[PDB]
Amino acid sequence: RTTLAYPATAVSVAKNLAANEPVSFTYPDTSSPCVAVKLGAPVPGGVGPDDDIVAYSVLCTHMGCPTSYDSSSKTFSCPCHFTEFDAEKAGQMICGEATADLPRVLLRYDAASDALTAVGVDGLIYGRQANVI
Amino acid sequence: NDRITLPPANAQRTNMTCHFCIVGCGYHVYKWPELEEGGRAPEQNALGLDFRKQLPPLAVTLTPAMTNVVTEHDGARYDIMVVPDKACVVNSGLSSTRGGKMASYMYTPTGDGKERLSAPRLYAADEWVDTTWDHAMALYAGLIKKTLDKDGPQGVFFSCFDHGGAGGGFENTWGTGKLMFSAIQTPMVRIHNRPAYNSECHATREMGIGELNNAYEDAQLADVIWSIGNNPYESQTNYFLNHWLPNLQGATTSKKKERFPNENFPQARIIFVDPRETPSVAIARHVAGNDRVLHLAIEPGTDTALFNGLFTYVVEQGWIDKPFIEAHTKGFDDAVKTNRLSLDECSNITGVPVDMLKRAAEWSYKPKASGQAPRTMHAYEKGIIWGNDNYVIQSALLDLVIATHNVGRRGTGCVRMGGHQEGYTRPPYPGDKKIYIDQELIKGKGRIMTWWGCNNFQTSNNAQALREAILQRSAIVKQAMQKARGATTEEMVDVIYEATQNGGLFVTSINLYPTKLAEAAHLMLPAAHPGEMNLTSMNGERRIRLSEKFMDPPGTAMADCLIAARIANALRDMYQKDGKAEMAAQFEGFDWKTEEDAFNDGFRRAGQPGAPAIDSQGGSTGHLVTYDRLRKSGNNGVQLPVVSWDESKGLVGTEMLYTEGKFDTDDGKAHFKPAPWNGLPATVQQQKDKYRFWLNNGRNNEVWQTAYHDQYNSLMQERYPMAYIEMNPDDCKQLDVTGGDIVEVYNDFGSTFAMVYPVAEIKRGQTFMLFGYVNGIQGDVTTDWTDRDIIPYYKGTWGDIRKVGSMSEFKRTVSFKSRRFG
Ligand SMILES: Nc1nc2c(c(=O)[nH]1)N[C@H]1C(S)=C(S)[C@@H](COP(=O)(O)OP(=O)(O)OC[C@H]3O[C@@H](n4cnc5c(=O)[nH]c(N)nc54)[C@H](O)[C@@H]3O)O[C@H]1N2
Ligand SMILES: Nc1nc2c(c(=O)[nH]1)N[C@H]1C(S)=C(S)[C@@H](COP(=O)(O)OP(=O)(O)OC[C@H]3O[C@@H](n4cnc5c(=O)[nH]c(N)nc54)[C@H](O)[C@@H]3O)O[C@H]1N2
Ligand code: F3S
Ligand code: FES
Ligand SMILES: [Ca+2]
Ligand SMILES: [Ca+2]
Ligand SMILES: [Hg+2]
Ligand SMILES: [Hg+2]
Ligand SMILES: [Hg+2]
Ligand SMILES: [Mo+4]
Ligand SMILES: [O]
């Protein structure tokens, strides 16, 4: 096999998420903190009925400090060397010292159950040799 | 992808200084066979890190962009990993976003370096084709010989790097310098970033103070740091992060108290002199709090008035070191008279409130309670170097610094923050006149022009007038070559020479890539960068290190000093065969097989018995340095000047200059200079009176220079598809433009384009546009104005803005969110 074996991890149902209110969860294991957020307005790659739910690993890709979500700017901010990533542009680094965008947690949205499930990661999570240890 | 190949425990590791900015962060390059890999257990990989479980924050800097797979000339493939060195005192393991991409910017046939020049390229009248090195040399040396023979050196022009790091360095500056100055002997030479053969630091040097006079450790020991015309978080990242921030955070207080037991050390403070509120000001406030930061948001071009006001005030308050002035300086009383300016007039001119001027002076110069003057490091860069009259601004600033004894004491210094690294060893410039090269080319002078390690189409001031003229003169040479058939090299040399007698100019570019210069060049030669060759250079605290070769250059690309040797030897042989012995002798001294030969011949011969005149940043003890000794020193290298060398102590250097008050002048004293305040130059004032916006310009943290590598990187092109212009939101609203729209920026000097980037921090009537980029060149609107030594006021221009329209794809894909952390 050429692919890693990512778990399928239930996050919540989409209707339970409040606009711009982040949900913390771990994926693909408990040492990998992530945040999902229903942004309120559609963005490329967002899922759910309004194509606005996205999720990311929150460990800064520069040196791994946990980033914080800023609701007023819809960005993730790293306090260590000041990098900031855009949650509305697939983790695009706005300014900073990292050489990779914030890793995106791929979500599946199932209309039959309303469930949001984390099923993969695009980008390499800080501090590991492969996304799945 | 979603995984990385770890270096095996026994992987080859070599030292590499960052290719890019002045800081000169230390890195390691791991190289190992493609099909091998290290294990996750710490003792089974070369990083010594445990990848069997999640690593903690700050444990490593490692992403896929820091890795690559290279293919050697023998066809063997090797994994490479270029990561920062935790033990290097400069960066302590930090990597900026620019140096972190080094593995990605190494040459590979399929990656970001796919388009590296790997063979001589010739524009054969009406098409680009490859050509052989022998032919390129017969043509190039042929034109140089014909021009020397008929016109003399005045017909041979060059614009060449004079810097360190990649595309510079002691080997390369010596090679090119020996060739242009000692062999060809032409005075028609400009430098990569300024249009004449001059210095960015004539005033400070004449006053006796070399611009890199301290250690980065001095930023840790200072009570106050001034950052003047400088955005260090973005432009000297790791010096700001590893040395300035720890001081603001209080992590260096115990060091200060340990060195100076009877001295008070208040919490450190920082003062920014910059018309613009930058990411550096924002971070300083975040870290130190607003009350420990002063942003002197001066009116553009008013630095001289600011410093004259501060100098007048500290003299009136007695906040100067009178014993130091009396024992180690000359010219103080005259400077007090010539530079007199009240705080009220200073405030009126600069726009800075009188209370803030007084607060800056109190924090910086008023004696601490324990008696000593604060240790105030005055750091400056291009906001004043390319400011309103470089010579006068520096005269004003250094007067203030000298009077307050802020050179020579630990925790102080009045230093350039730097651009590229430094690595200068050259013969003296063969002329007595200051020649504005771009103006001479625009006026039709010269037969051949060589851009070497630079791209003035994107970086000259008044760039539009330069490109207009060069494209037209180049076209004349192409049209003349179009008439030929079956012409030997010799006949083509005459055809081209005759075209140059009719307005034409033969253009050559020696570079890593085609660049926009390819729109006019007739010949392009492939060069090699650090890692494809050995290279020495020093950083902003004079720390010289060796970057080690670890891979082959693409195709036939070659170190610049070796291209210079190839040219010199081609010309020597041509003169020998033409029976011109005296001319041939001028080209002796280039029997070099490797770049180390250029190091031995230039840097290591400075001041030695029997050597010719050599201007070297290594000075007369440079011979103590050798590649083997630098290698043993690791990425810590040695701070120049070297004091000694022996097997037991290794190289021993110098941390700070002028600690005994012995300055670099006739009498050993620092010299005060007059600094008249003249307002903006008339050329710039005319644009300001006619147009609405101040067109400030400069660096973006993620983009490196002319984006020669970045233009090929998918993440960089997604984030910055076009040069951007920061605009005040009220100004944007009035003009009906928002993030992602494209505007024309123009004035009497030129017209260019940028994507709008609304920034709340920008002042009304002011803007800031990314300089030297590959899509929307900022320099087209800079003026031709230069100071007395031909230093341009690049930061001094005004123009109007016209909406083109909404670039829907930029709106869909580019973030226009704040780059100021807050
Ligand atoms: N408006 C405005 N203009 C400015 C400035 C500004 O602030 N505002 N800044 C000025 C300053 S400070 C500078 S430094 C200049 C920069 O002006 P340039 O020197 O023209 O720009 P760089 O991108 O540094 O150019 C380096 C070139 O050398 C090539 N190169 C890289 N490595 C090598 C190598 O090993 N060998 C060779 N032969 N070529 C190599 C690169 O591909 C690139 O084309 O711009 C100046 N222009
Ligand atoms: N990220 C990155 N870093 C780099 C480079 C790069 O391309 N990218 N280039 C390197 C090079 S070659 C250089 S030269 C340095 C440049 O380093 P800096 O000089 O620090 O950078 P700039 O952005 O050119 O200009 C610095 C500041 O000058 C201010 N300024 C403009 N006009 C004035 C004025 O009249 N007075 C004053 N006091 N300030 C003014 C601008 O607002 C700007 O913030 O950066 C080096 N490091
Ligand atoms: S990584 Fe490179 S770009 Fe400057 S801050 Fe360090 S030398
Ligand atoms: S660890 Fe996030 S900016 Fe360095
Ligand atoms: Ca133009
Ligand atoms: Ca913010
Ligand atoms: Hg200077
Ligand atoms: Hg706007
Ligand atoms: Hg920033
Ligand atoms: Mo520069
Ligand atoms: O520079």
Q: Write the DSSP string, B426-474.
A: EPPPS-SS---HHHHHHTT--SEEEEES--HHHHSTTHHHHHHHHHHHH
**Amino acid at residue number B543:** R
Which residues in chain B are classed under CATH 3.40.50.740? 117-198+421-528+556-618
Calpha distance B797→B780 (Å, rounded): 11
Ramachandran assignment for B453, one of left (phi > 0), alpha (psi -120 to 50 degrees), beta (any other): left
Which residues in chain B are classed under CATH 2.40.40.20? 680-814
Q: Which of A99, A122, A128 sits opposite B97 (nearest CB)?
A: A99
Which DSSP helix (H) or strand (E) runs through B627? helix B627-633
- What is the distance in angstroms between the Cα of B70 and the nearest Cα belonging to chain A? 20
Give CA angle at B419 (B658, B94), nearest 5°.
90
Indicate the SS3 state at residue B571.
helix
* Cβ within 8 Å, pair B4-A88: no
Which DSSP helix (H) or strand (E) runs through B595? helix B595-601
Tell me whether residue A98 is one of the annotated catalytic residues. no
Calpha distance B540→B415 (Å, rounded): 9
Calpha distance B120→B126 (Å, rounded): 16
Give the pairing type, strands B448-452 and B156-160: parallel
What are the CA-CA distances from residue B366 to residues B219, B318, B670 (Å)? Answer: 19, 9, 22
Calpha distance B494→B139 (Å, rounded): 10
Distance from residue B726's CA to the centre of ligand 9 (Å): 14
Query: For residue A76, what are the domain limits?
Result: 1-133
Specify the CATH number of the domain B199-420+655-679. 3.40.228.10
Indicate the SS3 state at residue B742.
strand
Torsion of CA B225, B231, B232, B237, to 10 degrees: 160
H helix intervals, B303-342:
303-317, 322-328, 332-338
| B455 Cβ closer than 6 Å to some ligand 1 atom | yes
Best mutation site among B117, B118, B192 for ligand 1, i.e. most ligand atoms within 8 A of its Cβ?
A: B192
Distance from residue B276's CA to the centre of ligand 9 (Å): 14
| Partners of residue B65 in chain A, C-beta under 8 Å | 99-100
Indicate the SS3 state at residue B217.
helix
Which DSSP helix (H) or strand (E) runs through B224? strand B224-228
Contact B163, B423 (CB under 8 A): yes
- Own/partner long-range contacts of B128-131 (Cβ < 8 Å, ≥24 apart): B128/B518
Which residues in chain B are classed under CATH 3.40.228.10? 199-420+655-679
Tokens 């601004």 locate to B393
Tokens 């920026």 locate to B745
Give the pairing type, strands B128-130 and B425-426: unpaired
Q: Does A89 touch chain B (CB under 8 A)?
A: yes
Catalytic residue among A81, A82, A100, A133: A81
From the CB of residue B578, how many other CB atoms can be counted at a distance below 10 Å?
A: 12
Calpha distance B514→A61 (Å, rounded): 33
Closest protein CA for atom 1 of ligand 11: B419
Helix (H), strand (E), coil (C) string for B8-50? ECCCEEEEEECCCECCCCEEEEEEEECCCCCCCCHHHECCCCC
H helix intervals, B71-223:
102-105, 133-150, 170-177, 202-206, 217-221
Indicate the SS3 state at residue B683.
helix
- What is the distance in angstroms between the Cα of A96 and the nearest Cα belonging to chain B? 7
Q: Does B65 touch chain A (CB under 8 A)?
A: yes
Number of H helices, E strands in chain B: 29, 31
What are the CA-CA distances from residue B599 to residues B583, B594, B757 (Å)? Answer: 25, 9, 46
- Return the bridge partners of A12, or none: A116
Calpha distance B640→A129 (Å, rounded): 40
Structure tokens at B535: 């290279």
From the CB of residue A126, how many other CB atoms can be counted at a distance below 10 Å?
A: 28
The b-or-e profile of A36-75 (16+ CB within 10 A means b, else e) is bbbbeeebeebbbeeebbbbbbbbbbbbbbebebeeebbb
Give CA angle at B185 (B182, B190), nearest 5°.
105
Asked whether the CA dihedral B410, B416, B422, B424 is positive or negative, the reply is negative
Q: Which of B817, B818, B819, B820 to mutate to test the interface with A (most CBs of A within 10 A)?
A: B817
Q: Does domain B117-198+421-528+556-618 have CATH number 1.10.287.610?
A: no
**Amino acid at residue number B120:** P
CATH of the domain at A41: 2.102.10.10
Which DSSP helix (H) or strand (E) runs through B642? none
What are the CA-CA distances from residue B95 to residues B24, B61, B82 (Å)? Answer: 10, 7, 10
Which among B117, B105, B114 is positioned nearest to B20, based on CA atoms? Answer: B105
Contact B546, B631 (CB under 8 A): yes
Distance from residue B216's CA to the centre of ligand 4 (Å): 22
Structure tokens at B501: 């007698």
Calpha distance A79→B449 (Å, rounded): 49
- What is the distance in angstroms between the Cα of B289 and the nearest Cα belonging to chain A? 15
For the annotated binding site of A for [2Fe-2S] cluster, the residues are 60, 62, 78, 81
Calpha distance B706→B358 (Å, rounded): 40
Torsion of CA B791, B796, B802, B803, to 10 degrees: 90
Chain A residue with CA closest to B100: the answer is A99
Give CA angle at A57 (B103, B710), nearest 5°.
30
Which among B313, B315, B366, B365 is positioned nearest to B344, based on CA atoms? Answer: B313
Contact B596, B630 (CB under 8 A): no
Contact B41, B52 (CB under 8 A): yes
Contact B787, B391 (CB under 8 A): yes
Which among B329, B328, B228, B215 is positioned nearest to B278, based on CA atoms? Answer: B228
Q: Which of A97, A101, A119 to mutate to test the interface with B (most CBs of B within 10 A)?
A: A97
Tell me whether residue B751 is one of the annotated catalytic residues. no
Torsion of CA B287, B293, B297, B302, to 10 degrees: -130
* Cβ within 8 Å, pair A97-B100: yes
Contact B91, B23 (CB under 8 A): yes
Contact B371, B319 (CB under 8 A): no
Q: Which of B52, B101, B818 sits opposite A99 (nearest CB)?
A: B101
Structure tokens at B629: 């000794």
| Partners of residue B60 in chain A, C-beta under 8 Å | 63-64, 127
At residue B448, what are phi and psi to the nearest 5 degrees?
-130, 140
From the CB of residue B807, how many other CB atoms can be counted at a distance below 10 Å?
A: 17
**Amino acid at residue number B225:** I
| Partners of residue A1 in chain B, C-beta under 8 Å | none
Chain A residue with CA closest to B280: the answer is A82
Axis crossing angle, helix B560-577 with helix B133-150, rounded to the nearest 10: 60
Which among A44, A58, A74, A55 is positioned nearest to A14, based on CA atoms? Answer: A55
What are the CA-CA distances from residue B186 to residues B28, B138, B181, B267 (Å)? Answer: 40, 20, 6, 54
Calpha distance B244→B448 (Å, rounded): 46
Contact B143, B448 (CB under 8 A): yes
Asked whether the CA dihedral B701, B703, B706, B708 is positive or negative, the reply is positive
Torsion of CA B748, B749, B754, B759, to 10 degrees: -70
Closest protein CA for atom 6 of ligand 3: B25
Which among B133, B188, B122, B142 is positioned nearest to B495, based on CA atoms? Answer: B142
Look at the domain B7-116+529-555+619-654 and name its fold.
Answer: Phosphorylase Kinase; domain 1 (3.30.200)
Q: Which of B66, B81, B97 to mutate to test the interface with A (most CBs of A within 10 A)?
A: B97
Contact B701, B237 (CB under 8 A): yes
Closest protein CA for atom 4 of ligand 3: B21
Chain B 221-280, residues with CB within 8 Å of chain A CB atoms: 233, 237, 241, 279
- What is the distance in angstroms between the Cα of A107 and the nearest Cα belonging to chain B? 16
Asked whether the CA dihedral B383, B386, B388, B391 is positive or negative, the reply is positive
B681: preceding bond cis by omega (within 30 degrees): no
| B501 contact partners, CB below 8 Å, separation of at least 6 | none
Contact B346, B308 (CB under 8 A): yes
Kindly identify the ligand whose nearest atom is closest to the C-alpha of B818. 6
Calpha distance B537→B422 (Å, rounded): 6
A28: preceding bond cis by omega (within 30 degrees): yes
Best mutation site among A77, A83, A126 for ligand 4, i.e. most ligand atoms within 8 A of its Cβ?
A: A83
Tokens 């003062």 locate to B271
Tell me whether residue B227 is one of the annotated catalytic residues. no
How big is chain A by its Cα radius of gyration, in Å? 14
Calpha distance B319→B167 (Å, rounded): 45
Task: Give the distance between the most distant pair of CA atoms in chain A.
Answer: 43
Calpha distance A33→A41 (Å, rounded): 24
Kindly identify the ligand whose nearest atom is closest to the C-alpha of B459. 1
Structure tokens at B172: 């390369």
Give the pairing type, strands B670-671 and B543-547: unpaired
B326 is in an annotated binding site: no
Which residues form ligand 4's pocket by a CB distance below 6 Å? Answer: A 60, 62-65, 78, 80-83, 96-97
B211 DSSP assignment: S
Which among B71, B14, B81 is positioned nearest to B45, based on CA atoms? Answer: B81
* Cβ within 8 Å, pair A128-B59: no
Structural gaps in chain B: residues followed by a C–N separation over 2.5 Å: none
Contact A123, A61 (CB under 8 A): yes
Q: In total, how many domains does chain A have?
A: 1
The b-or-e profile of B527-559 (16+ CB within 10 A means b, else e) is bbbbbbbbbbbbbbbbbbbbbbbbbbbbbebbb
Calpha distance B356→B365 (Å, rounded): 14
Q: Does B41 touch chain A (CB under 8 A)?
A: no
Which among B545, B536, B544, B546 is positioned nearest to B640, based on CA atoms? Answer: B544
* Cβ within 8 Å, pair B57-A88: no
Indicate the SS3 state at residue B240.
helix
Catalytic residue among B104, B182, B235, B395: B235
* Cβ within 8 Å, pair B55-A77: no
Indicate the SS3 state at residue A104.
strand
| Partners of residue B286 in chain A, C-beta under 8 Å | 82
At residue B468, what are phi and psi to the nearest 5 degrees?
-50, -50
Calpha distance A130→B645 (Å, rounded): 46
- Return the bridge partners of B724, or none: B755
Chain B residue with CA closest to A30: the answer is B54
Contact B357, B347 (CB under 8 A): yes
Give CA angle at A11 (A8, A13), nearest 5°.
115
| A111 contact partners, CB below 8 Å, separation of at least 6 | none
Contact B548, B101 (CB under 8 A): no
Contact B123, B514 (CB under 8 A): no
The b-or-e profile of B792-803 (16+ CB within 10 A means b, else e) is bbbbbbbbbbee
Q: Does A40 touch chain B (CB under 8 A)?
A: no
| B43 contact partners, CB below 8 Å, separation of at least 6 | B9
Which among B662, B686, B678, B646 is positioned nearest to B798, based on CA atoms? Answer: B686
Distance from residue B194's CA to the centre of ligand 2 (Å): 15
Give CA angle at B23 (B19, B26), nearest 5°.
60
Calpha distance B354→B105 (Å, rounded): 49
Q: Which of B4, B6, B63 sits opposite A99 (nearest CB)?
A: B63
**Amino acid at residue number B407:** V
Indicate the SS3 state at residue B573.
helix
| B168 Cβ closer than 6 Å to some ligand 2 atom | no
Structure tokens at B352: 């800075």
Calpha distance B121→B514 (Å, rounded): 9
Asked whether the CA dihedral B293, A76, B19, B641 is positive or negative, the reply is positive
- Return the bridge partners of A35, or none: A24, A56
- Return the bridge partners of B28, or none: B15, B83
* Cβ within 8 Å, pair B3-A4: yes
Give CA angle at B821 (B98, A94), nearest 5°.
50
Q: In what order do the strands lie in the sheet with B26-33?
A: B12-17, B26-33, B77-84, B67-71
Structure tokens at A58: 């929150």
Torsion of CA B179, B184, B188, B194, to 10 degrees: 0
Helix (H), strand (E), coil (C) string for B475-513? HHHHHHHHCCCCCCHHHHHHHHHHHHCCCCCEEEEEECC
Give the pairing type, strands B766-770 and B724-727: antiparallel
Calpha distance B69→B67 (Å, rounded): 7
Calpha distance B124→B117 (Å, rounded): 17
Contact B717, B723 (CB under 8 A): no
Calpha distance B481→B127 (Å, rounded): 11
From the CB of residue B612, how many other CB atoms can be counted at a distance below 10 Å?
A: 11
Distance from residue B782's CA to the centre of ligand 2 (Å): 15
Which residues form ligand 11's pocket by a CB distance below 6 Å? Answer: B 193, 419-420
| Partners of residue B104 in chain A, C-beta under 8 Å | 99
* Cβ within 8 Å, pair B4-A127: no
Q: Does domain B680-814 have CATH number 2.40.40.20?
A: yes
Structure tokens at B93: 């393991």
